[model samples]
Target: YTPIDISLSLTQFLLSEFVPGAGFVLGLVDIIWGIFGPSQWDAFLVQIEQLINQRIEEFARNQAISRLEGLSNLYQIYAESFREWEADPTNPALREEMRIQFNDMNSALTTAIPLFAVQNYQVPLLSVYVQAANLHLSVLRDVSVFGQRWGFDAATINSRYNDLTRLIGNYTDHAVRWYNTGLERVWGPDSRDWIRYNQFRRELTLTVLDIVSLFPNYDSRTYPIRTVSQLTREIYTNPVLENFDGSFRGSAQGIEGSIRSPHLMDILNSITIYTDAHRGEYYWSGHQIMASPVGFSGPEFTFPLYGTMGNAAPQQRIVAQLGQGVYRTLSSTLYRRPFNNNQQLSVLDGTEFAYGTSSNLPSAVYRKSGTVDSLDEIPPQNNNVPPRQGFSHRLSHVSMFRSGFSNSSVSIIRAPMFSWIHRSAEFNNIIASDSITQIPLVKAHTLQSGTTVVRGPGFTGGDILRRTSGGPFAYTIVNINPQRYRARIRYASTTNLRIYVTVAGERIFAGQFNKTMDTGDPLTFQSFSYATINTAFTFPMSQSSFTVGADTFSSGNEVYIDRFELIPVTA
Candidate 1:
């Protein structure tokens, strides 16, 4: 029932795919020594045999040379947005506009990324340069209005902005270097304006990315930022950088009409799913909870959402189930030991015990409870300790009433029921093959037809359904899991519309799908939008059906619907 077995084979295959170099590592006794070391010399010979025959030079040049131009174009658009920031750097409104543009740029770059993801893996250079663009745009989008609406004081704002602008100045220059360096190599001679990025400036740029990595609550997808700093530095600092001798510095070019670059091999290995590290794994580590002072002056202006003063020392009811049937208590704190290219969740918890103690480790605790209490408070850990008795309180740490949670404390899950490459007005039939069947949720209306077919859910088919008339339309995730899941619908409307959605037999969402949110028109289409039922609802296997209704109110509504996605509240 799971595709994990297939992925294991793929990971194993790619595990051995990263041969050091094409010719340099495979030349002689060197080749034998290298083969004896880490790589497979026999496999390298087989790999090179095809590499020589496959018109790799031409394939490499055209495939990458073409998209390299697109990459430059994408970067230029991003650069243009930066110029807009200077026009009114302090204006929150303008910053928001820049934020929007950055998001668009990020989307364009990511979509264009797969374009370079050709099977040949022609450009690992794209990985770093493209990543620089991704990192900058993402960082900028995050900090766009951080100083203003987000309430950074003028002094902090001015200081951070000064550092950032300096960093960005060097950042953009480095981007221009890659843009020109890439072009001159593959196709023709253009701008020779290439230099090693200044080490201080590059390091400063990395500082933000590193800071970003510490807070997973911000963005858990750390791979883009995790490896980029050193890799970019390595690519930028090659001695031949000052020479600009065409093609990437470490790449080779003695062949008749082609170039053999290790960048290609690197990319080949990268796009391969070695591990689900980006998804990350989790566990509940036990540590006795402590209290912090409660006030606006203190770290947490600790006003309980539904409790009174801190639990006192003499309080006897420490172990009983609190929250009645509400929130649960926890004896553990969730910490994610990252999983990505470097490590796998398959690596078990061994460090705390040092292979001695079989079960519990202080840093790696997994607390359990008895059947009498699903999630009862640990009476031993009082809300307040001695010195901080009057000043502090500890909140209940149990998780209860949540329908979707892992065997561990918490997780994020994505088992796509509305999964597909083709979705929304902005989305197109990319990645997935055409010739996929299209089953509209509705039986009628103007189907915005396209020649392209796309894979959906199980690579079968699903599509957006619009309601020109008013009534209830139903949908179902045919084989969805029993975990609690969120439903996100991508839709659009002309006049104004309303939405009523119920899963199983319980109503989950009710809202007005307003037209004012979109472009103030009934004709021209904007980006197909999102309406997420952020709350998770349990779905019994027997009652997988959903009833979704729409109107313009008793209601009225091209109210085009691209699709609805059921995302898990917790994985």
Candidate 2:
């Protein structure tokens, strides 16, 4: 019934080009003689094939355009009548606008049915499906509009009830026609029980109608079904819907006007809190209701969080783990590093600089740079090291805050004096206490061709230095060849080193090595070491893909390398 959420451009292109023209040509018949010949059956078959193909294409195009039209109509109502009730909720003008818009939306919904009727076009295989789906949808929409509009005392609406009932009946009849066609051509011929006995169109129609009949008149209690369904449904209706960009937890605070969830299958609308099923045991926004006309107290809660906190989601289940092998293999004891990498060889704390030591290994030029070879490494000298540059070595303390699901959180503090602190509660947290944590921020600095040392280490600690003007530079390597590929490093001399890379505020790679670098040599590095800390990667699947370029560097130390490879492998 649905072709999934496909793009309008693609559907339009396909319908205009390949689907219609090509399909017609594919079934075009070459006659041996004039029409009166005995070879007429072949021509008939070809004509039937062409007809079917054309009809399917037509159906697809109609569906695509109709969906767009429906959206246009629905939005038109929202735009024109959204504020109608605001000026005066009881005014005649406001009431008329609301009623008109609501009716237009309902009508737009039904127009899609007759445009796709079973056997309406002599198409094969798919002829019945589109019709049945549209008809069924028509029935639901009619019932929904009638039910939702009932609470407004719009008696004029009932005057049109006969028209709506007729439409539903008309669509229902067409649906039965298609259902029978499906039975005869599909299930009946194959002895399939898809429509066998009680499983036929009549039974399903009854069930759907039963739900439609139960659609609470707008004056009745409301249900939360639409809230749950609306989130996912919008994704289907509009591709532009985006996930949380930087907004905190989702809130319903600003939704004040009458609104319809156009994306939901079952049409729903609301104007009052009571219509939303707020009368159960826990609905409290401090709404006061009288027990007797205008008298006594109805109910009281000694302490909130009774039925309020007890309702669990219907679809929730314990998430199953990968395997017992994972638990056994994970190291319970943490690794401690007073300092990550010592810069100077044969010297304590020589590798003090913590830059990434990752290298870019592109299987081909297209393979992105910063993937391998170099990773997050310590700086060779005391240059521009921010105080909170590196990941916290160990967890000092953890505090748990138990609010409801909306406010629950866990905060982590680095040990001893608490140099670093992180809140796992919220994905985003503002950094505080400059003395305690060193936040590594990626900065672009271009060095003059002959410049040597760059200063002002900011908040962390030091600077990034390079030796020869055409030699080594300070930069962040994004990521390169991962699991299967490694960048080969040919070292010239042994030198103390520190290297690291952070993209979009998340550190991706890092490493620390202490050795001397001989003049004529290239030191290869890989991002795999820090891979354990953060395993999530976003990359093209091929080894030939890469992102490589020289970033401006704050200078002091110099180094160079020859080659890197981004090999791809399947695990």
Candidate 3:
């Protein structure tokens, strides 16, 4: 798990095979530290070590250093798009193009991030400069220089621009020193053990690679906006293509030198037994129920065309049974905590309880019926909740006539068979005189994929919010100090209600802010006011839109909003 394990193993492997003297550049660091004798040479070694350590820390934050800061070459291209619009601002087409291009710049932060990542991490000395560039840009963007604010009116933009520009130069300068620092640390002017030095050089060269963490930030740095023209051209045109080896693709096996496999289809298929099983049944039954056959979304295994899979008729029955089995398993699984593997499923396996037998046919078998339910009556909690009511409605109205059953008696006897078709059928028709009913069903909005609009069932009013059903809380810890950190909120609301934003180590934002509104309504400096609803600030882009909020009441509400982006303008 740790890098030390790999380093040790590599050393052992080298020592066994190569000449003992040359085997494993073996403690060049220890040897250097020993010969230096706690004097000037040792001090020099420590200095270089500090430089490398500093580079690593900075690269961890943002690996690459681009030649251009925030608004670079790409900004030039976008600015060109605006040339036609400034003279004729009334022209709708040109104005719209300008807005679109500006938006692209706003979003480009995510994409251009990767170029810096690759360049910084890939090149040793370059990485050090990249780190310095980031610090300089951050300081300029966030803090003041000399005694005055780094940005104030015309001075603000100019100062910010200068700091960022300087960041680019610093990155290049530090990169050159980064290599020099490494050479001083390892070889130390004496090229005596050149062979041993080469091994150490290679190990230190590629071991903790830069690109591994580089790609993750690519989109974030360039989000919503396209990269500046030159960087964009470089990214798409030049990629981490071929890696170190002059090839166009990478090997998936993690081997040192391997080619990308063209025939990985079989390997991928072999790895997914569970997915294939589910797909087989889903496709076969779907064809029968819909009365029309179409290819499924992913891979397909057709029935009726094959001997073992058979025609739609038998496949339909098998699929129905399997579906019921899966549903039953899933329902039972809800009472359990998360399990990493089937091995961990045993964590919830041992606990058991009893259920009472009853002659009284329950109306809804899935519901807490017969005055006693195993799931509901479990100690310390009544956690068992009924499955979806829509499902119950479908199961409740199952007709014996369509099923070819003769009477209620026959239906009663074959009810288990019906449960076989649908596991929750019992809860679907629980007609008991006294049994626990369902809780008031609310729309459990889960933003599983893309952005989910938080409007009500028919777009009603309230706080349209997205909270995690059951996961780690994004921000729950309170701040020891409410000041000293910059807090920016970006949301439009009908009421000026105090909303919580991000939290850092010690500082926080105190209460409901009197932010400027686009609505042009009278500003009321009250804690709670009805008409004085606050909309977005002049700079709405200065907030975090990615992280979701905590518990929001209005159960669901609708003006587009995201939690405040916590920028340490002063911290």
Candidate 4:
């Protein structure tokens, strides 16, 4: 059957008026979906639904019967205890015992009633017990509370006292009758059971109506005496069905409001039906499940039987299924091309393949751009090889220029680079030609003790290596043209520095660097930029060694040699 037809039929059957509980009244309509889902198995699916309902009914009936049996036993105990209390009016302990019995009955009955029923008739049966217990308990608790204000003379109270006693006496009879009726319905009537006996039991049950009718209000302080009238109506009217109708009810009916009777399966099926009707469908493709119809603006649904559709796209739909392969409608072509393992079909140039659209060439891979170009025409690639040779200096592939002096009787190299290799050239003294007492001062300054040069190169404190001598005072040289390079000197002094370099024992370049510090300058200046003297010069090719000498153009000269460096010059 089609889904629509099946749902309508099942909905009517499941929700038929004879169905007892709301829970079982409206669920199996969704079984229609499963039946139509695999249309080939529709008949088998229908039979499965019938079996499910039958088993569910059996389970619910047994459960209700179990609760009813326990309730009956508790009632019988309460009735016997209550009778003893009425016999001894003077015993306080007897009264207490009666109260205990009453409360036990109330607790047991309240617990037995299902807040939501499983079987249809289960709710109606439980409510009968609940109504009977509520009527008696409410009267007992509130009657005591309002007793003093009830304004009853001892004579008036004594008149009603026997009515209370008589009522408790009838409880044993009613409890026995109700319990037997339930047993008879579930386990068939005993051979001795008679319709005449049931008719008398019904009359006895109706007597409660008469007992409670004498009082207009069970409580003057709380809710009106609803328990009594409600129970009285149920007793006279509730059907004691010998067997269930099997047909389900579509809606609540008389006395049904007093029952919480939603069945579990019906509730679940209702939810499933709602979700399927509202939610969209799902689809799967052979190639990792691709989507068609780019964007969806309206309602979408899955194809029947499969229940598989990912989403709706802007129309001119494309569909793919296994075995039948991929189908394109626009060109009216079906591609049955077999794919090797892991191979896929797709538009190489990413063109729109819409319905009615045609292509001159069949699907194939195209050549990529720049594939025919030469390696030289391509951009240069970066290399990551590191330097592994001498010094690892920035200017690789070259050797450092050498230096020497003709008159090297006293020449010294004092930098870290020349420390060990040039140890024998360590000429440590700087002798002045003229004595310190005969020196003329160019700039008067504080003179600290000891020679500053002795404090080590790059020294900023103490006395400097000064001279009041003439030109060509002391020479410190290196062999070879230490290359025609740019070099910088780091030192601090107020005096102008006159440095001369000789190539092959001849002055090839003589340039003087000076720092004319102001009188307010600090005693020691320390800064690469402010204290350094940078000079660039080229040495001739024929040069063997060079000499760098410190001298004064004038008689009064103060000079300090801290440290110097020859920097590389690149072409």
| Winner of 1 and 2 under lDDT | 1
Candidate 1: tens digits of C-alpha lDDT, residues 45-147: 2222232233335454354445444544554544455555555577676666655655565455545545443454422233233333333433443443443
Question: Order of all candidates by TM-score, from best down to worst?
Answer: 1, 2, 3, 4
Q: Go through the candidates in order and give the clash count of each.
A: 16, 93, 42, 20
What digit string (tens of lDDT, one per residue) describes model 3 on residues 1-571? Answer: 2222232222223222221111111222222111222232223223324434534344332322232333344444554554454456566676566555544553464345445445444333333233323323332332222112111356644554554444434343334344434544444222222222332333332222221111111122211111110000000000011111222122212221121111101000100000101212211111111111111112423222110122323332212211111121111111112334221010010111121122221221221112222222111101123332111111101111011111221110000000111111121111111111110001111233323334221111111233322111222112121122233333444433344432332222234433234333321111111111122212222221222232232323222232232222222
Q: How accurate is candidate 1 locally (lDDT)?
A: 0.30
The candidate maximizing lDDT is: 1
Native RMSD of candidate 4 (Å): 48.9
Q: What 10-residue stretch in candidate 4 is worst by lDDT?
A: 264-273
* TM-score of structure candidate 4: 0.19
The model with the greater TM-score, 1 or 3, is 1
lDDT of model number 2 = 0.24
TM of each candidate vs. truth: 0.26, 0.22, 0.19, 0.19
Model 4, global lDDT:
0.27
